[PDB]
């Protein structure tokens, strides 16, 4: 279906240590494929998925150079932002940048993004037209003018509409055996008395990919929100995901309730009922 | 493949 490539960059200042901690990761869809950690010994961008290992030395030298440059820029930014907010040099602060692109099911460009945050809140972002900026406050307005003068959007736009999308299609093809697979959810139901007069029904979806899935409870074929609970979709550790949805029901009415599961890997949406 | 060579400072 639809696909994305995204890069994430976090830097945390550490007053009393020599330099901020900088951690960068890259994903295609929900799968991690590279990382960099400023504190680790290698000082290289490292492979995290098997299909990226085939890239040759020019690729790895280039990606390591860029991500090292990016650590330096985040380091200067943490100082600039402290100065802009007149903040003490004693505190630890955070900078985050993410960028990337999406393609559709036809694999053509859908949208690109580039966003930045300071201490967990929006600072500046490129808008969807990839020509203009939104700034959170007056500090960010000075940044925005600077980036406008320097034609940052133009260069980001060229990358996101071009290289970002091409290298994504390249990865999708070189990793096709794992990136273009769908693992349909393995599905079952659980039952527990929670009271004398109540029972909980829990509907499980396991080992599915991609992470996107929808789980809903109905009663008499009508959607049920009351006394339900949905957990956050969680990673299994092996490249797949898990989720469940529960409903507490009057005991003896279990058979009125039905769990409904939709996933790309399912030719048709499953319906489950207690045993 | 990342954006490069690098970003302007904020």
């Amino acid at each position, epitope marked *: 279906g639809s696909h994305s490539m995204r890069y994430f960059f976090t830097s945390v200042s550490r007053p009393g240590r020599g330099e901020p901690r900088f951690i960068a990761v890259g994903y295609v869809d929900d799968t991690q494929f590279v990382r960099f950690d400023s504190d680790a010994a290698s000082q290289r961008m490292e492979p995290r998925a098997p299909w990226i290992e085939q890239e040759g030395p020019e690729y790895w030298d280039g990606e390591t150079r860029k991500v090292k440059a990016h650590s330096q*820029t985040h380091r200067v930014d943490l100082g600039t932002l402290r100065g802009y907010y007149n903040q003490s040099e004693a505190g630890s602060h955070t900078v985050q940048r993410m960028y990337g692109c999406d393609v559709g099911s036809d694999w053509r460009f859908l949208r690109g993004y580039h966003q930045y945050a300071y201490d967990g809140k929006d600072y500046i972002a490129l808008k969807e037209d990839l020509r203009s900026w939104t700034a959170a406050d007056m500090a960010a307005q000075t940044t925005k003018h600077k980036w406008e*003068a320097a034609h940052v959007a133009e260069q980001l736009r060229a990358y996101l509409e071009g290289t970002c999308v091409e290298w994504l299609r390249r990865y999708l093809e070189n990793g096709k055996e794992t990136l273009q697979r769908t693992d349909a959810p393995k599905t079952h139901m659980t039952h527990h008395a929670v009271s004398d007069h109540e029972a909980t029904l829990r509907c499980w979806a396991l080992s599915f990919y991609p992470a996107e899935i929808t789980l809903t409870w109905q009663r008499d074929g009508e959607d049920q929100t009351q006394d339900t609970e949905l957990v956050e979709t969680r990673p299994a550790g092996d490249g797949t995901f898990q989720k469940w949805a529960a409903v507490v029901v009057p005991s003896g009415q279990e058979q009125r309730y039905t769990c409904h599961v939709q996933h790309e890997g399912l030719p048709k949406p499953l319906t489950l009922r207690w045993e | 493949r990342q*954006f490069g060579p690098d970003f302007p400072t904020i």
Partner: T-cell receptor
Amino acid sequence: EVEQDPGPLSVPEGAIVSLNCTYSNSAFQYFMWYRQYSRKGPELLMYTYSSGNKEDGRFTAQVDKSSKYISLFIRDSQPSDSATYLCAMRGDSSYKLIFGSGTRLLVRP
Amino acid sequence: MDAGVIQSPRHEVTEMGQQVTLRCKPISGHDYLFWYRQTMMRGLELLIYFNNNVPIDDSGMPEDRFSAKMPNASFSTLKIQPSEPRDSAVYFCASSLWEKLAKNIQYFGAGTRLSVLE
């Protein structure tokens, strides 16, 4: 590796001059020209992203990424244009430039 | 006029075997610094550049005898030890800023002309 003919080129004042470079590596994306006078540093003239045609006064820089061939044209050449002309290029992984070996131009008064 | 990039020494003529030190002060406020050299044999070529004082690309540094440092934003050094006749060249330092580099602008010093003799 970029290939640039050394010349020297000798042309009469008022002539159109054409300089060029060829390259091999398709990762190059940014193309530039410099002038350097005898015993001095290089001076940026003109600079072209990706493809296309770029005019400034008597200068036109051009890039053809299909043919991997870049060129600079100087209209109405002048004695003060007499210099060595170097092309330079890079990709987007680094600010490191690769330069051609230069063409010496003599514009005769 | 604010100063441009300052290099020193302007000229150096020295015997092989010695250490040579080339120095560069970038335009103050600039956060990138480049070292190039130019000879007849290999042309004009990047040795190393720094950003925020850290070496970013040093793929053009000779594999032995050459060392580049930037201890602070105002000062870089390129050292050669022991020097050899083939090190003779003009060495250029340049500095720039992101917004100037996006337009392929950098600011060059006047260079150091180095002859190392047998």
